[PDB]
């Protein structure tokens, strides 16, 4: 295995094949979404998605070489970030809409249904448009997500940090590779590589805000108790 | 914190 | 003016010459420090530093090219992030210590003096070590900071976004240039370029946390009435 | 919010 011996193409394939499935929301809401109504939906979705992420994480080259304690940590910091990059990637072709699920496409206005939720919707949408504006390829999308998983909790945890960095380097050669084959010039490659990474900065920022927002919804018991999703949220107070 | 732990260990 | 016209070396020089000074903490309160005591210090420092940052921001190529409303926004989102990258950069050659001011070098333990403060300290320190671990050259340091100023508030604000991106591209060619001249290979350059940007992700994360922490200190009344610094903090609730 | 505004204009 060792994520340091697979050619770029083996890396991209490994990441594509590891891709989780896309899930559906509850097929029975639709009704003038109330704040409770809509929150139970997104959390129920997030809860079932977490299970697929946990099993996705293992399929990411080298993640396993890690100690359990370190796999636990990494997913506790990036769980929302990763959920968000997916949503953003799925919303790509629905300008003005956020495709939370194939049966739950929301536009900015519905974000107003939950106190403080619209702000984050705007950020998510801006990034969606940013990806489309950049015509982000799926091949790149899987890299970016794998990077987030490894680079978010690495500095909060030395041989463990070392591995994460050796790997993150392979994901960067592989990312550059994807750009080279698309005919870009060197300047356009490192130029694009910088553009994509700079977005991971807003994805962090949006996650921090959402994390704080989710926590605010819990203090209003407006959010159900999906244990897995609760633990994840709790990892951000510890 | 066990839920996340358990799931990371399964087959 | 246009920054997209000046050459790489002109860019680095422009950024070095624009650099702000390393201010001093208030002399006398030497040590130790009460939670109040230490907070009055860091905020008084941050408050006087803001004035220098505002004037630094104008000296950054292409910034004064933005409209006022946009310069105001950009600085409202990155002010703490920028303060932090500076501290981290100044702490570089002070393993285990955070050089807030020459006359105010703090080690992890003193972070325990202010509630919830220590946690941030560990993050700052981990980044300091990360920079030293990477031998960050000042030339790179000035680029990274300029990037933060432009890339933090750009998706929270279309010709305005366009400029910010055209510029951010110049700062990336210029950043690549700095690595090329250091003898690094192409692979090592885009590899290093990715490493540096991925750190801007933790700098965002640490800022979010500090921002939330500062706000928590205001609700306790340990934070002096530093108007400029208050407005900045307020831009993150409004 | 004026402090930040004023300072950005001193030109
Ligand atoms: N929007 C926004 C911020 C946001 C706030 C909140 O209190 C809960 C959730 C859940 C999800 C969510 C669930 C499933 C996904 O695939 C993506 C996001 O996003 C959320
Ligand atoms: N550490 C930490 C987080 C942190 C928390 C807080 O409540 C106030 C401040 C002020 C500064 C500060 C001041 C001047 C600098 O140059 C850099 C950081 O950092 C802070």
């Amino acid at each position: 295995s060792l994520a340091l011996s697979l050619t770029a193409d083996q890396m991209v394939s490994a990441l594509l094949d590891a891709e989780p499935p896309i899930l559906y929301s509850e097929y029975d809401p639709t009704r003038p979404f109330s704040e409770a109504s809509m929150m139970g939906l997104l959390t129920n979705l997030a809860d079932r998605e977490l299970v697929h992420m946990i099993n996705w994480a293992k399929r990411v080259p080298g993640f396993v070489d890690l100690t359990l304690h370190d796999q636990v940590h990494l997913l506790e910091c990036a769980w929302l970030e990763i959920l968000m990059i997916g949503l953003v990637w799925r919303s790509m072709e629905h300008p003005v809409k956020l495709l939370f699920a194939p049966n739950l496409l929301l536009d900015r206005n519905q974000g107003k249904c939950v106190e403080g939720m619209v702000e984050i919707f705007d950020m998510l949408l801006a990034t969606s448009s940013r990806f489309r504006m950049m015509n982000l390829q799926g091949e790149e999308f899987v890299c970016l997500k794998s990077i987030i998983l490894l680079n978010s909790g690495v500095y909060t945890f030395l041989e463990e940090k070392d591995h994460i960095h050796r790997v993150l380097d392979k994901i960067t050669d592989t990312l550059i590779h994807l750009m080279a084959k698309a005919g870009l010039t060197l300047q356009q490659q490192h130029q694009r590589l910088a553009q994509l990474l700079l977005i991971l900065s807003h994805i962090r920022h949006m996650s921090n805000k959402g994390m704080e927002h989710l926590y605010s919804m819990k203090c209003k018991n407006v959010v159900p108790l999906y244990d897995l999703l609760l633990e994840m949220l709790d990892a951000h107070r510890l | 914190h066990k839920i996340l732990h358990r799931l990371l260990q399964d087959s």
Side-chain angles (χ1 to χ4, degrees), chain A residues 54 58 68 71-72 75-76 227-228 231-232, chain B:
Chain A
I54 286 175
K58 297 175 183 186
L68 187 69
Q71 307 183 318
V72 159
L75 285 167
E76 303 194 312
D227 295 291
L228 179 48
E231 303 197 318
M232 307 307 283
Chain B
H1 190 191
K2 301 310 82 190
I3 285 177
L4 176 52
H5 262 290
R6 185 183 66 200
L7 273 48
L8 272 170
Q9 286 184 171
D10 285 19
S11 164

Side-chain angles (χ1 to χ4, degrees), chain A residues 3 39 132 154 174 221:
Chain A
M39 281 300 302
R132 176 162 38 58
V154 73
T174 294
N221 307 291

Side-chain angles (χ1 to χ4, degrees), chain A residues 51-138:
Chain A
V51 176
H52 287 282
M53 189 193 314
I54 286 175
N55 280 74
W56 160 74
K58 297 175 183 186
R59 321 289 157 56
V60 175
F63 182 75
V64 271
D65 306 322
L66 288 188
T67 65
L68 187 69
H69 178 300
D70 289 313
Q71 307 183 318
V72 159
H73 179 66
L74 286 180
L75 285 167
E76 303 194 312
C77 264
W79 74 262
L80 206 198
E81 278 182 287
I82 296 172
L83 281 182
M84 275 169 29
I85 198 186
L87 164 57
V88 153
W89 163 259
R90 298 197 300 283
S91 302
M92 284 261 292
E93 54 177 297
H94 298 77
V96 194
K97 305 286 189 185
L98 291 166
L99 186 49
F100 280 91
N103 68 325
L104 178 51
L105 185 75
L106 306 172
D107 59 287
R108 184 179 189 290
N109 292 308
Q110 293 161 303
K112 299 186 187 186
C113 293
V114 180
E115 186 188 64
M117 177 57 88
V118 57
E119 313 87 345
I120 307 180
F121 263 48
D122 287 334
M123 291 186 266
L124 288 174
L125 287 172
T127 308
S128 182
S129 298
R130 180 54 185 168
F131 277 1
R132 176 162 38 58
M133 192 187 296
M134 287 187 81
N135 184 38
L136 177 57
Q137 292 299 290

Side-chain angles (χ1 to χ4, degrees), chain A residues 55-232:
Chain A
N55 280 74
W56 160 74
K58 297 175 183 186
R59 321 289 157 56
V60 175
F63 182 75
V64 271
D65 306 322
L66 288 188
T67 65
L68 187 69
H69 178 300
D70 289 313
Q71 307 183 318
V72 159
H73 179 66
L74 286 180
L75 285 167
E76 303 194 312
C77 264
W79 74 262
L80 206 198
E81 278 182 287
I82 296 172
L83 281 182
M84 275 169 29
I85 198 186
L87 164 57
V88 153
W89 163 259
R90 298 197 300 283
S91 302
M92 284 261 292
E93 54 177 297
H94 298 77
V96 194
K97 305 286 189 185
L98 291 166
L99 186 49
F100 280 91
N103 68 325
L104 178 51
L105 185 75
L106 306 172
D107 59 287
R108 184 179 189 290
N109 292 308
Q110 293 161 303
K112 299 186 187 186
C113 293
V114 180
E115 186 188 64
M117 177 57 88
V118 57
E119 313 87 345
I120 307 180
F121 263 48
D122 287 334
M123 291 186 266
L124 288 174
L125 287 172
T127 308
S128 182
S129 298
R130 180 54 185 168
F131 277 1
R132 176 162 38 58
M133 192 187 296
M134 287 187 81
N135 184 38
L136 177 57
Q137 292 299 290
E139 286 76 39
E140 302 173 300
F141 171 62
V142 291
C143 286
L144 293 167
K145 187 166 51 173
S146 293
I147 290 165
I148 293 170
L149 173 71
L150 304 172
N151 179 60
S152 280
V154 73
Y155 303 141
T156 314
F157 282 167
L158 300 175
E159 295 193 61
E160 213 62 345
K161 283 210 62 180
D162 271 348
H163 182 217
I164 287 184
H165 285 132
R166 310 203 131 304
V167 182
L168 286 179
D169 279 326
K170 267 298 291 296
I171 295 175
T172 301
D173 301 323
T174 294
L175 236 180
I176 278 301
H177 180 210
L178 296 177
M179 309 183 167
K181 284 205 304 179
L184 298 62
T185 64
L186 258 182
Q187 176 182 40
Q188 290 170 296
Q189 289 173 46
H190 69 61
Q191 214 150 307
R192 187 187 176 62
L193 166 56
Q195 300 171 303
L196 296 180
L197 302 183
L198 286 169
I199 284 175
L200 306 175
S201 193
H202 302 86
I203 294 186
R204 169 78 72 144
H205 182 62
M206 292 190 278
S207 170
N208 281 150
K209 291 184 176 185
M211 204 72 250
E212 204 66 71
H213 173 275
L214 174 75
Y215 174 101
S216 127
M217 298 307 301
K218 175 174 169 294
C219 286
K220 329 305 164 56
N221 307 291
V222 182
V223 172
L225 272 62
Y226 303 119
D227 295 291
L228 179 48
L229 168 63
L230 257 41
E231 303 197 318
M232 307 307 283

